[PDB]
Amino acid sequence: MYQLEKEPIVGAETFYVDGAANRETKLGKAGYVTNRGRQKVVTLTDTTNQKTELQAIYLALQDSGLEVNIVTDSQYALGIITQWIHNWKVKNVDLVNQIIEQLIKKEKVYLAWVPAHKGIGGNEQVDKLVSAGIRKV
């Protein structure tokens, strides 16, 4: 893949990703839930809210097939990744480029943003998973 899809890929698994992190401890969780009934969460150290969001996208790329829809609620994650694909058309640098490294090997990728905490089913589910034991209120 050298460019992102303009619309969702029909028949491709859709991963709803999210992350949460504790400001003081830097412990966080990154995870996904998909429309094929799969979920994964990993616990991370020395991380941030922004970094957990990128780590979640990494997990979705790692676990998905060659065509994949990924739905994030992170302005930062979408912005920073998009700032890459258009660029070749400083912070979390390694992780961003590792995501790009995964992206180019896919056949098709649709990456979309949705607003957090607005009752989007998949998004609410993954938010509940990653914030458990991480986000107080």
Ligand X SMILES: COc1ccc(Cc2nc(O)c(O)c(C(=O)O)n2)cc1Br
Number of C-beta neighbours around residue 63 at 10 A: 14
Among 74, 103, 109, 111, binds ligand X (CB under 6 A): 74
Query: How many residues sit close enough to ligand X to count as binding (CB under 6 A)?
Result: 8
136 binding partner (options Mn ion, ligand X, none; Cβ < 5 to 8 Å by kind)? none
Under 8 Å CB-to-CB from 2, ≥6 apart: which residues? Answer: 89, 104
Number of C-beta neighbours around residue 133 at 10 A: 11
Q: By CB under 5 A, tell whether 127 contacts Mn ion.
A: yes
3-state secondary structure of 122: helix
6 binding partner (options Mn ion, ligand X, none; Cβ < 5 to 8 Å by kind)? none
Can you tell me the distance from the alpha carbon of 31 to that of 41, in angstroms, rounded to the nearest whole number?
Answer: 4
Among 13, 16, 18, 59, binds ligand X (CB under 6 A): 18
3-state secondary structure of 79: helix
107 is in an annotated binding site: no
Instruction: Give contact residues for Mn ion (rule: CB under 5 A).
Output: 18, 73-74, 127
Instruction: Give contact residues for ligand X (rule: CB under 6 A).
Output: 18, 53, 73-74, 116-118, 127
